Amino acid sequence: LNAKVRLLREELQLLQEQGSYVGEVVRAMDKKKVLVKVHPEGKFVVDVDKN
Amino acid sequence: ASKLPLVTPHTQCRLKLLKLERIKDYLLMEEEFIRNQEQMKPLEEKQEEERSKVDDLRGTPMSVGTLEEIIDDNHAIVSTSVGSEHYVSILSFVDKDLLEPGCSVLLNHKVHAVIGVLMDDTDPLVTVMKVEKAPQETYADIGGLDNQIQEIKESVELPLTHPEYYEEMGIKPPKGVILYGPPGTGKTLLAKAVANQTSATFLRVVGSELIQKYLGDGPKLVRELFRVAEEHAPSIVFIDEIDAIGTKRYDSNSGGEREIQRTMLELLNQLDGFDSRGDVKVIMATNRIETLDPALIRPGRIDRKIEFPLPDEKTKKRIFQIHTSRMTLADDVTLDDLIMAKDDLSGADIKAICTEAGLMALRERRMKVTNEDFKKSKENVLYKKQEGTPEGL
Ligand SMILES: Nc1ncnc2c1ncn2[C@@H]1O[C@H](COP(=O)(O)OP(=O)(O)OP(=O)(O)O)[C@@H](O)[C@H]1O
Ligand SMILES: [Mg+2]
């Protein structure tokens, strides 16, 4: 119960963090970069997180 | 690799040995110098961290634009995905030999400077048109052409195989070849054989594919077919069944005839016009050559004109053997009896005879083809004659 309450108390400031775009991967390339189509915008050559 | 242009006599000569020995000596000097300097200090760390500075300069979220115009002063107009266009600076680490209008460039996120170019798909029309290795077969299958094979080789193969012979005499190779003959003699067969035996991008188009349904698309198709023929190094463009697009060009016609004429004019210009044609060789086949345009088959357009005659007496035996090679036969086959008749038989007719004989043997369940089977198949094949007996004779 205490964990539930604590999570619901920090969730207010956890919910103001910016979302993340959802894109479609075209093909991996280069050192560690990727080519992604972020609809409705154009494509990007983005990095990849270490994980 | 951007090496010196020898431009010595260009024929095996002592001057060309000396210029070449000099290049080898200089290259040996460079190799020794680089090896010794690498041993003294790797310089790998120095080579690295320049890439790190470059990656710092080009931010993480590189955007893909579309180059529109180069102002020729390390500046450009680049269009973003939304449609907006920006006047930016082409930075120094981008290989400018790749930049051309319409290319997919990589743009900086904040400053939109050009910081790279992306590779592009490889099928404008190449995958559709190119034939790869001809599935039919190599030169072995073709039987009884011989002289025609030699002419085709002297036209398309020899220039790529031994060009010194031409460069010595100073003559450029003959421009193009047109293969003409009655239906079923081996024009397409020879074209496919040279396609599979050659080392150049071979493109095949049937004239009926140039009769498009929308205005200007036939001309656009020919323009693009020759456009992706200089982009692919040595190439051979084989326009089979030219008779569909080329014709006497009678002015008094209406309908799609005008559009076909315009397509033919565009093809004429591509074959020989204001611009140099680069290194592209053209082959054309036509059952009916008498109806073509003199402008289309004038000497400077098509130099060589090869005639394909119907097999007479021994070419017939050769085709029969070639097409019955992979087929078990009973020891009673009178192939000579089959061919002896002067029935104007064509090679396609022989192939049909063999295939139908095999098919009817299969139908009867037998394990071997018989002479009677071959005779009945030949009779069935020759049943497709038609026409009127007394008429014309
Ligand atoms: N001399 C030959 N040797 C082997 N096969 C032959 C010969 N002549 C014709 N053929 C056979 O004819 C078949 C029909 O294709 P081919 O290339 O011969 O036609 P074509 O002469 O170009 O005819 P068309 O003018 O109608 O286009 C080929 O599959 C080939 O098997
Ligand atoms: Mg043909």
Ligand 1 pocket, Cβ-based, cut-off 6 angstroms = B 141-145, 183-189, 285, 287, 319, 322, 347-348, 351
CA distance B88 to chain A (A): 18
**Within 10 Å of residue B104's Cβ, how many Cβ atoms?**
15
Q: Which residues contact B277 (CB under 8 A, 6 or more apart)?
A: B270, B271
Query: Which residues on B lie below 8 Å from A46 (Cβ)?
Result: 60-62
Known binding-site residues of B for ATP equal 181-188
Query: Which residues on A lie below 8 Å from B64 (Cβ)?
Result: 35, 42-45
* Yes or no, beta carbons of B64 and A46 under 8 Å apart: no
Give the angle B126-B293-B277 at the CA atoms, nearest 5°: 40
Q: How far is the CA of B8 from the centre of ligand 2 (A)?
A: 45
Counting ligands in written order, which one lies closest to the CA of residue B191?
1
Q: In a 3-state reduction of DSSP, which class is residue B154?
A: helix
CA distance B79 to chain A (A): 11
The tokens describing B359, both together, are: 């098919």
Counting ligands in written order, which one lies closest to the CA of residue B206?
2
CA distance B114 to B95: 11
CA B1 to chain CA centroid, Å, is 27
Strand-pair partners of A45? A35, B62
Q: Which helix (H) or strand (E) holds B107?
A: strand B105-107
- Integer CA distances (angstroms), B94 to B42, B51, B99, B116, in order: 26, 13, 9, 5
- Kindly state the DSSP code that residue B157 receives in the 8-state scheme: I
Closest atom of ligand 1 to CA, residue B348: 12
The structure tokens 């054989």 sit at B193
- Of all protein residues, the one whose alpha carbon is nearest to atom 9 of ligand 1 is B347
Query: Quick check: B39 contacting A, CB < 8 Å?
Result: no
Residue B221: what are its φ and ψ, rounded to 5°?
-65, -45
Contact B203, B225 (CB under 8 A): yes
Q: What is the largest CA-CA distance in chain B?
A: 97
In 3D space, the residue among B179, B291, B184, B309 whose CA is nearest the CA of residue B236 turns out to be B179
Render B6-56 in DSSP notation, one character per residue.
--S-SSS-HHHHHHHHHHHHHHHHHHHHHHHHHHH---HHHHTTHHHHHHH
Known binding-site residues of B equal 181-188
Between the two ends of chain B, the Cα-to-Cα distance in Å is: 70
Q: How far is the CA of B296 from the centre of ligand 2 (A)?
A: 19
Q: How far is the CA of B276 from the centre of ligand 2 (A)?
A: 29
Query: Which residues on B lie below 8 Å from A42 (Cβ)?
Result: 63-65, 80-82
* Yes or no, beta carbons of A45 and B106 under 8 Å apart: yes
Q: How far is the CA of A19 from the centre of ligand 1 (A)?
A: 66
User: How many residues are given for chain A?
Assistant: 51
* Yes or no, beta carbons of B61 and A44 under 8 Å apart: yes
* Yes or no, beta carbons of B61 and A43 under 8 Å apart: no
Q: Which residues contact A46 (CB under 8 A, 6 or more apart)?
A: A33, A34, A36, B60, B61, B62
Phi-psi region of B76 (alpha: psi -120 to 50; beta: other; left: phi over 0): beta
- Integer CA distances (angstroms), B229 to A26, A39, B100, B144, B369, in order: 29, 36, 18, 32, 47
CA B310 to chain CA centroid, Å, is 27
Q: Which helix (H) or strand (E) holds B69?
A: strand B66-70
The interface residues of chain A toward chain B in range 1-51, judged by CB-CB distance below 8 A, are 35, 41-47
* Yes or no, beta carbons of B61 and A42 under 8 Å apart: no
* Yes or no, beta carbons of B64 and A41 under 8 Å apart: no
Spatial strand order of the sheet with B114-117 comes to A24-28, A34-37, A43-46, B62-64, B105-107, B114-117
